[PDB]
Design a protein around this ligand. Structure first.
Ligand SMILES: NC(=O)c1ccc[n+]([C@@H]2O[C@H](COP(=O)([O-])OP(=O)(O)OC[C@H]3O[C@@H](n4cnc5c(N)ncnc54)[C@H](OP(=O)(O)O)[C@@H]3O)[C@@H](O)[C@H]2O)c1
Ligand SMILES: CCCCCC(=O)O
Length: 314
């Protein structure tokens, strides 16, 4: 039900994702999620909906449905806020929108730093992303002081390859180890190597886009669909479960935290009924063989950035 982090905290294995959840639909989505039993919400400043998520969290807290210590709220530091003096400000903005006084986990969204400004993806006269000269080590030192100031209980990373995680772990004077590395993971991108590396170092892995993210704005009609994969449909039918329930249970049995996104009440409910069954070792090994190394989030606009994470094997 919950995984132990290196800071002593317990992180709920199942969480509700909020990327692409419209401002006018997410408040109700989070309210239903909390009613259904979700105790973990994944957020980010760049999703442009934290205020509305915060409205839901505030209502359930006032209603006595849950107490703050029961919830595990996660947010992420965007690329345009990597410089030393901007990290605290970004964290505080997220805290005010969510209407909380601390986050359970704060992640560096991407290892790539962009030029500070109002645009999430700053462009030059040529049209490409403008990089910041900041590095991963300096941004990490700024995240560490957020822990020292009481703004966040744990800090982590997202979309960091193994060498980038290595840099943080080998940093002179390292005070706090990354608690979590949130990466893309599903049957078409199994990440066996990165997952084995992180887990050996005591870093919890959170699998995002577990259903293949069928609502990504860059979707194409010829792209493979996990939910419609006949091979996965067969495993689901063998268990009297839906394909989504199988795709959510899959990472859980690999000791990964999973965060499926949904704004639909019946689906939020369906995605929760994943604790009452088990996939056999055969089902697990079969699902792992479906790997194609297909990424939903490849951050293609930053392929030339000095800290682009996907050039290395893992
Ligand atoms: N750290 C990062 O860089 C990063 C990147 C990507 C995602 N994430 C996080 O991961 C979360 C989940 O990933 P994601 O949003 O990419 O997509 P996902 O969870 O893989 O898929 C979401 C899509 O699947 C649909 N869906 C949900 N449950 C379903 C069900 N039971 N049956 C059929 N369809 C279902 C949703 O539809 P409805 O909503 O219409 O129900 C939505 O269209 C994100 O919201 C975000 O919080 C993090
Ligand atoms: C700018 C849109 C960012 C959403 C994909 C992510 O979570 O990184």
């Amino acid at each position: 039900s919950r995984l132990l982090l290196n800071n002593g905290a317990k992180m709920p294995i199942l969480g509700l994702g909020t990327w692409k959840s419209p401002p006018g639909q997410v408040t109700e989505a989070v309210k239903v999620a909390i009613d259904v039993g979700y105790r973990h919400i994944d957020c980010a400043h760049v999703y442009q909906n934290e205020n509305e998520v915060g409205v839901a969290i505030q209502e359930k807290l006032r209603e006595q449905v849950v107490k703050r210590e029961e919830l595990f709220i996660v947010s992420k530091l965007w690329c345009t806020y990597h410089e030393k003096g901007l990290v605290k400000g970004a964290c505080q903005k997220t805290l005010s929108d969510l209407k909380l006084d601390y986050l359970d986990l704060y992640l560096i969204h991407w290892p790539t730093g962009f030029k500070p400004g109002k645009e999430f993806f700053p462009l030059d006269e040529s049209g490409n992303v403008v990089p910041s000269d900041t590095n991963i080590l300096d941004t990490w030192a700024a995240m560490e002081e957020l822990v020292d100031e009481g703004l966040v209980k744990a800090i982590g990373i997202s979309n960091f390859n193994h060498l980038q995680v290595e840099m943080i772990l080998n940093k002179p004077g390292l005070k706090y180890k990354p608690a979590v590395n949130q990466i893309e993971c599903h049957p078409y991108l199994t990440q066996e190597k990165l997952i084995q590396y992180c887990q050996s170092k005591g870093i919890v892995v959170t699998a995002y886009s577990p259903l293949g993210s069928p609502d990504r704005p860059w979707a194409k009609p010829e792209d493979p669909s996990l939910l419609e994969d006949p091979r996965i449909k067969a495993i689901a039918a063998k268990h009297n479960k839906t394909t989504a329930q199988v795709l959510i249970r899959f990472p859980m049995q690999r000791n990964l935290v999973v965060i499926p996104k949904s704004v639909t009440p019946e689906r939020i409910a369906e995605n929760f009924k994943v604790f009452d069954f088990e996939l056999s070792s055969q089902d697990m090994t079969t699902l792992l063989s479906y790997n194609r190394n297909w990424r939903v989030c490849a951050l293609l606009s930053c392929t030339s950035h000095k800290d682009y994470p996907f050039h290395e094997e893992f």
